[PDB]
Subunit: 44 residues, 4 copies
């Protein structure tokens, strides 16, 4: 009734979190590319 209706708000709030740990992993990921790129422009 309402009790699965939070087995819904609950699971979800855990999805925003899981999403956020992802974005900052995208960022870590990018950082390492910009840099790794810059070492290649220069090693030339």
């Amino acid at each position: 009734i309402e009790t699965q209706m939070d087995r819904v708000v609950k699971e979800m709030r855990r999805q925003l979190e899981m999403i956020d740990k992802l974005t900052t992993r995208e960022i870590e990921q990018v950082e390492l590319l910009k840099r790794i790129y810059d070492k290649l422009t220069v090693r030339t």
Copy 2:
């Protein structure tokens, strides 16, 4: 459950926003990757 329904949606449209920036960013990632990779092929 009428107004928590309402909350649920709001939070969902927020969750797509996020899944969107993610999607943008992977596109960028992938081009840098190919860009990076081309140069390894030049040298």
Copy 3:
């Protein structure tokens, strides 16, 4: 009631579509890194 209640399953169907794009994109990069990784060792 049911109105807002599918402005919900609507989102989810759309959410999971995107979670599918990424997983295949991710798949693409994972083997572009492997290509670059393989070569660096060659360029050595």
Copy 4:
């Protein structure tokens, strides 16, 4: 009623198996970027 609310929760936990496979996948990218970035720092 409960019928569609039941669906809702399903495809939601479906998405958590997904994003979980995904993190496990961007982790494995990150290890390759480190390891790639280390290898140049040497040449």
